[PDB]
RNA sequence: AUACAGUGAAACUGCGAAGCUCAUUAAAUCAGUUAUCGUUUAUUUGAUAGUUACAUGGUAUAACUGUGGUAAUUCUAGAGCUAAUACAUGCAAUCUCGACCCUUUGGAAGAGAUGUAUUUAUUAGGAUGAUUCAUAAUAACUUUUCGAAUCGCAUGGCCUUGUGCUGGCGAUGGUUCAUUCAAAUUUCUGCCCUAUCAACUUUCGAUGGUAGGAUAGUGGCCUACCAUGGUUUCAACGGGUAACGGAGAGGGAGCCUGAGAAACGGCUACCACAUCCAAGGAAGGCAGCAGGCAAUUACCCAAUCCUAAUUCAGGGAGGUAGUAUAAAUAACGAUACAGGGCCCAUUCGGGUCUUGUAAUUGGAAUGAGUACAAUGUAAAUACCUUAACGAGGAACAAUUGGAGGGCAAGUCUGGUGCCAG
C-alpha cells in the first residue's frame, strides 16, 4: 500500500504517579479548575515540559545567536498570544518560570466560570458541554480549549442557547404546555 | 428570508449558458433544496426551470451559509443537449435507464 | 541583516506575460 | 523546502503590511474538537477554494491520498498545536543558517567582492 | 413506395481481441544518451494514379426449407434454394519543337512525345558533412501489382423534351512518399567486497577477412575457405551479497493468424491426470482459484480514461457501497431536623471549628434514544444541516480492585467458669 503515518500522544504518565505531594497536587488542581481525570494534568504537564525544555535549551546557546534569538523570540510570542505570558514578560527565563496553573487558567471552562456566566466550574463545563458557549460565533463543547485574548473577550451566550435569546428549552415548554392544558 | 447571491459569472457560448458561484444564506433553517434553488434561479435569470442546474453545494460549517455552483443554459433544449444524464435524471428530464 | 540575506536567498531561489493570465483574461472575457 | 516559519513572522511584524486576519469563530476547524486552525493550513484551504472556484467543480479526495492528509494533519495539531499556533516547529531541528545564508553564487567570496558590496 | 425503400432476429462480410503464480538476478537488469545513409510500421495527418459498360458469371453458398443417424457434444450426412465493399472477370485524350511569320497575345502545315509495382544490367546525377541518396532514361523480367462493375443523403444548371446533356455533400476502398503511434538493433556514461578468484577464451566460432544463407533489415546471426587471433595485475574470468533492493498457464516438441505475439488463442504427435457412456466412442486442461490449520459480496459506466461497422455499445480499466481520540452518566436553589466533624501523636494525650443527614422540597438546561425532511449521490449509504417527542430511582439502572467491620436460641475445634480460634 502507500506511506504510513506518524501521529504520537498528547501526554505521558510521570516519572513515579504515587509521591503524595504528586497525588494531592492533582488533587486540588482538578478541584479549582475542575478537571475529570489525571490524564489531563499528564496531558499539560507534558507541554508545559516541552516549552520549558526548549527554553532552556535557547538559554544555553550564547547570546545574539539566530537560533536562540530566533526560536526564543519565537516561543515568546506565541506564549503571549496564548495569553500565558504578559506583554511586560517578553524574556525566555520568564517562560522558564511558567507553571501548569497558567495554561490551566486559560482553558476555556475557566473563562466561561470566571467572567460570570457560570456560577461553578462544573457548571462551566456543563454549559460548555450542553452548547450554550460561543467564543464569537462559533459554538465550542469542549472544556480544554485554551482562549486567546481576543478570543478572551469574545466569550458570550449562544443565539441558539435558550438563555441567549432562543426559544425555552423542552423542559420550560413541555411545563408551560402542561400549564395550560 | 433565503438569500441567493450569484457571483463569477462566466456566459459560456461555447456549451451556451452562464456559469456561476451560488451563496445562499438561510439563516435560522437547514438549508435550501436544489429545487427550490433552482426555481430562485430560473425566476431571476427570467429562464425556464429545465434551463437552470445547480449542484456541489456544501454548508459552511457553524450553518447558516452554503456554497455551490450553478449553469442557466440559454434555452431548454440547450440544456438537455449538453448536460449530464445524470443530472438531467435528478430533475426529471430524462429517464433512468 | 540576516532577514535581508534569506529574502535575497528566496528572490534567489524564485516577452513578459503570464499564461494564467490570459487564460483569465479570456475567463474575463467571457465573464 | 527552505521556508523556515519563525522566519517570515519577522516579516509580518516588520513588513509594515496589513495581514487580513479572519473571524474569531470562523478558525476552529471543528466545535473545537480540533483546536483553532493553524496560519499555515488556512494557507492551504484558500489555495482548495482558489482552486475551486476556477476549476467550477470539488475536489474529492481519493479514499488512499485520503489516509495520509488529515490524521497527522490533525495530529501535528494534537501534537503540535496548542491555540493554532504551533509549538512543534522547535523540537524539530533544522539548519536555518543555510536559509540565511547568501550560500548564492553572488556571495562574498573575496575582498573585491564585499567592497563593491558596500559601495 | 410494383425493384426496394421504416425497424429488424439469424447468417455472410469489415474492425478489435497485444490480474495472478514461481524464479531470481551486479552496469548482460535498468537509467541517461547517440545512430539507423542498416531498419518494419495498423492507425492519425498531408499529398499522390487522364494511358456487356445505361454495368459480366456462379465458375455460390450461408442463413433458410425438408429427409435422417447417433447415448451424446460449439456431433452429423442427403436433397432443394437465394444476395455482397465475399468470390472470380472486365472497359474518337494530352503535351512539345513549331514553318506559314499568315496575324505580329494570336492561330497554325508537319514533325514528334506520352502509366505505375518487382527483379536484373546500364546511363545521368536537387539533398546532406558525407552516398551507388532523391530523381530521370534505356533493354528486358515477373505464378508482372495497382490504376472504383461499392454505399447514404439532395435533385441543382441547362437546353439540343428526351427522364437528353451536364451535377452537390459524404462513407467505404486504392499505389507511392512523407508524418505519427510504436518496435528492433545501437554509440558513450552510471558508488558493494573482492587475488585467501590470475589467467580466460578457441569447449562443436573464439578474434578478423572474402563469398554465400537467413533476416524489416547491419551484423559469424548462420554456412565454405583462409590468418591465429581477442580480454587481462589499468583487475579479465570466478565467488558472495538487505542486488524486491525475469519466466510459465498439466510437462517438454513442432506449426497456424496478425501492422504489431514465437500469443494466458487454435492445431498435431507424445508423456501423465482425469470425466462420462448403451463400453461402439466422446470430451477436458481445474494438475485451476479462494480459504482454514473460513460470509469477498451487491450497485454502475457517471467521474478519468480505453476499444468498435462507433456520439448512442461496452471495459471485475475504473468508481460506489457492504463488514490509539474527544464527551455524557448531571447543574442550581429552599426548608426541616440534629452536635458533633476532623487533624496530629509508639506511648499519654494534644490541636482546631459550622459541620451531618442513611430528611423534605422547587423551578430550569440538554445529550443519548424515538425520528418528519431536505441535501447529498449514476442511484444509494454516509456526512452537514434540520421539524415533533424525549429525565428524579433522572430504573435512559459504567465496571474493576482493595481495606475493614458487625449480626443468630446457627455450626466446628482447643483451653485454667462467662475465654480463644
Redesign the interface.
Known sequence: ????????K?YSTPKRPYESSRLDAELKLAGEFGLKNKKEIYRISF?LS??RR?ARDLLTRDEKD??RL??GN??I??LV??GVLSEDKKKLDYVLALKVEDFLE?R?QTQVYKLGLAKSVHHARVLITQRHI?????????PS????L??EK?IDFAPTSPFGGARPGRVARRNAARKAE | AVTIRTRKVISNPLLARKQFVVDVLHPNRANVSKDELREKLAEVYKAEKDAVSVFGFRTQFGGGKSVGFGLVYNSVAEAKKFEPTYRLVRYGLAEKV | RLAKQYLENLKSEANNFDAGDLDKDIIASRL | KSRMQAMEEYIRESSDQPDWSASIGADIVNHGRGGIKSLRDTEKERRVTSFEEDNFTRLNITNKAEKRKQKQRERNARMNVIGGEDFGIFSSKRKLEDSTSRRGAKKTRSAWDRAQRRL
Do not use: C, W
Not at chain 1, 460561543?134 to 469542549?142: D, L, M, P, R
Open positions: 500500500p502507500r506511506a504510513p503515518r506518524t501521529y504520537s498528547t507541554q516541552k516549552i526548549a539566530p537560533k530566533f526560536e519565537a516561543l510570542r506565541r498570544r496564548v486559560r476555556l460561543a467564543v464569537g460565533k462559533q459554538i465550542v463543547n469542549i480549549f485554551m482562549v486567546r481576543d478570543s469574545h
